[PDB]
Write a protein that binds this ligand. Sequence first.
Ligand SMILES: NC(=O)c1ccc[n+]([C@@H]2O[C@H](COP(=O)([O-])OP(=O)(O)OC[C@H]3O[C@@H](n4cnc5c(N)ncnc54)[C@H](O)[C@@H]3O)[C@@H](O)[C@H]2O)c1
Ligand code: NA
Length: 387
Amino acid sequence: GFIRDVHPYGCRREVLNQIDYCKKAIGFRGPKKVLIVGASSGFGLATRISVAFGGPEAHTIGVSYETGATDRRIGTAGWYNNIFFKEFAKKKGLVAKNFIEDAFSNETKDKVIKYIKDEFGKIDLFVYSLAAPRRKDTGNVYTSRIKTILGDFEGPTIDVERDEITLKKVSSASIEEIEETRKVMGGEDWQEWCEELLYEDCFSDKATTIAYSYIGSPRTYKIYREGTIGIAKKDLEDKAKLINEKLNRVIGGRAFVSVNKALVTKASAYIPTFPLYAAILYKVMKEKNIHENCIMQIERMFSEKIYSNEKIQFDDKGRLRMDDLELRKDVQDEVDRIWSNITPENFKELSDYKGYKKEFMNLNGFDLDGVDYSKDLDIELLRKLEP
Ligand SMILES: NC(=O)c1ccc[n+]([C@@H]2O[C@H](COP(=O)([O-])OP(=O)(O)OC[C@H]3O[C@@H](n4cnc5c(N)ncnc54)[C@H](O)[C@@H]3O)[C@@H](O)[C@H]2O)c1
Ligand code: NA
């Protein structure tokens, strides 16, 4: 029998690589009691590692939805990340709790809050960053769709299995899809978490909460500012204000949206035009030593913009812009320069495809220096592993 999409110890190592980046950094202080929804991967994971080993030596509750190994299956990356982060966190004497539940349901929130007042203590930083393809409740099921609102979006995607470009297309969304996508990817559940945490008295005074977005360049506005994702994110952005206002009154805190930069996801892999833009961008930004990955993105966000000596610099919209380096004039030009020369035949050498692909396999624990791949694994060893 063979591994599939996830390597369990490549996952250990990847978490560890991000921990080691954090341990070595200039270090910051601020949060001590931290709640993350969507803690098992991407920014949730990086945020969790950045607050635990960034030097705040903070305690964390991760909410995430993942499954593990049975005698037949191997389980998800996020599942293993949760386990290894616990392991490495307890070894440092920090609390890492794991609720592996549906975050959208009330009986989950009640589990979480119940846990906070009883054992954990007042949360000082709340990060909401779950990306689900679907939601529940009531008893209805809403599905998230990546679509336009008018016309078509076609552009190149990257087939990492076959190292080639494929032109893929995205059509227009029905009114209800526009609406299901807003229930999933908008800031409603965020808002409801926030409120229930506030009134059940779980926010430390001046406490902070973020949610994460993406804006992109004009090339992708049809999708990210105009489409079903853009409408979901403009809703999220809107709820940011309605919470900033509240927590500022009741407990003197703040809420806001952080606009992250272009990163390689699985879910970003089959949106048109973005895989290729990001691979180009990766090159551009590497030949300017300003490329950042997920953990550098978050480290920088905390130790320079949120929890630094200086005062917090917001955009003209109440949004923290961590895509500031991505959207710099010189950088965008160079992408637009390279874009017009890219072909299905030469793309591998005009964009940082290598790095783009490396970063894909790494999410899943593949292609990592520090791991023995030809080695075999034991299924009974992975199942006994618990969060
Ligand atoms: N390039 C991009 O398209 C791009 C760039 C920057 C930011 N983003 C934004 O990044 C944010 C996070 O990106 P990511 O890479 O961190 O995502 P990710 O997909 O890696 O993270 C998903 C998290 O959601 C958790 N989750 C999923 N369903 C859940 C559920 N039902 N209940 C509880 N938890 C659940 C998952 O367990 C996981 O923790 C997203 O909000 C996305 O919009 C996207
Ligand atoms: Na996340």
